[PDB]
Amino acid sequence: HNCFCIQEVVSGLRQPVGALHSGDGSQRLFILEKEGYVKILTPEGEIFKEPYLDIHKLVQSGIKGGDERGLLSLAFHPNYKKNGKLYVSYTTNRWAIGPHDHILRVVEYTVSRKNPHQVDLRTARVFLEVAELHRKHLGGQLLFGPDGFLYIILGDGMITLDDMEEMDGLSDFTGSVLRLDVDTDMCNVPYSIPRSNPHFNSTPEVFAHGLHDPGRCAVDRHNLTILCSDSNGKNRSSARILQIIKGKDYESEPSLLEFKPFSNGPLVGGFVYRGCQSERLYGSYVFGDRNGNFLTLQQSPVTKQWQEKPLCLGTSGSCRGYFSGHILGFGEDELGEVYILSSSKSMTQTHNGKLYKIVDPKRPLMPEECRATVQPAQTLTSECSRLCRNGYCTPTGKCCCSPGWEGDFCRTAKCEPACRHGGVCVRPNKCLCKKGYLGPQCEHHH
Ligand SMILES: [Zn+2]
């Protein structure tokens, strides 16, 4: 037979959202939970008791179901092994600059210099705040293409022309793919915009628009290709594709080409398999729906049209043709193997979300070629991590100072009118005076 195969990896999770890897050599797997947790799965199969990221108080994670309001996406820096930088997109509640139900946030975190299995929450750097009016069509998928730019895939938000021209506390960002350069040396702006962006100068972060209700978009690293499903509310069910070509400066927007290859209604999303266990699946675009029907989008090299071809599941040994509940998201190994994350109203009430791995029974679990050696995660050691006083330290390694600090790593304090009579500037605008010199700058004696 030619079916694939699913295997239970982990259970007892709370509403899983997705899972990814650190890219750091430790084959850690970080799994997202909707209430606002990122847990670590060890390559040997242990869930660490302490979460990697516990941010549940900051995130307004909606109850309902169909309610989309939780933690949305995580992305690791291509040089996290050096700089230890995360990017999280989540939904939060105090905004007073316009109308909202909530605001979709994009924040940068950094691992604890002391614990490689936990980030310290004090490192939060808000990158983007996107005012949202509705509790659907949110999106928020984060990803790094090659050349190292960060992509954010924001949905419709169900944002309509009425509310756009009604109030101004509304964002330009919804329904768009945004591409950013996090590798800034600037300290005035949290992120730089690459010169190869369309609207790089225009009187900007928007790389493409048109998106409505996208699932998890498939990402081909090969130039980059991102391919999205889209629900469009109750209006068909289409695929939209973005390709960037090979090193080209944009001044007008690339087309977000639409086509309609789907038939089995709404889809959760897809992935590009670049794993190792399955030879045949290599380089395939896979999309699954809520109930676990899988497809393949394949492109004719001749008549560049897209075609869907069903994939079957089937049991072979304890690796089974089915899984429990409904698919909520997808996952990937550092080795590139792919997972589905499931739950149900029955297994939500009990905290029983599952991680399931997809398997090719036609191949061995460890083909000779797929052998890799685990490189256990280490504590940050980079220059900026150890020296940069307080105030954020950018992914490039440049150390940005908080008000009233100066120097390469912000070690020297600033005294606006300088200290006198041999005083020492200890904190910003604080002088440590020698005995018998009083006042804010030690300017007095008698
Ligand atoms: Zn106005």
Dist. CA 169 → ligand 1 center (Å): 9
Backbone dihedral region for residue 57 (phi beyond 0: left; psi -120 to 50: alpha; all else: beta): alpha
Dist. CA 97 → ligand 1 center (Å): 13
Is 168 known as a binding-site position? yes
Quote the tokens at residue 359: 């398997």
User: What's the DSSP call for residue 287?
Assistant: E
What is the rounded CA–CA span in Å between residue 238 and residue 236?
6
Let me know: does 36 contact 71? Beta carbons within 8 Å: yes
Dist. CA 167 → ligand 1 center (Å): 6
What is the rounded CA–CA span in Å between residue 260 and residue 339?
26
Domains and CATH numbers, the chain: 1-359 (no CATH), 360-446 (2.10.25.10)
What was the resolution (in A) of this experimentally determined structure?
3.0
Residue reference for tokens 């990697």: 52
Q: Which of 235, 333, 232, 246 is nearest to 30 (CA)?
A: 333
What is the rounded CA–CA span in Å between residue 283 and residue 309?
15
76 phi and psi angles, rounded to 5 deg: -95, 150
Dist. CA 252 → ligand 1 center (Å): 26
Give 336-357 as a DSSP string: --EEEEEE-STTTTTT-EEEEE
Angle (CA) 352 355 359, round 5°: 145
Specify the amino acid at residue 368.
E
User: What's the DSSP call for residue 146?
Assistant: G
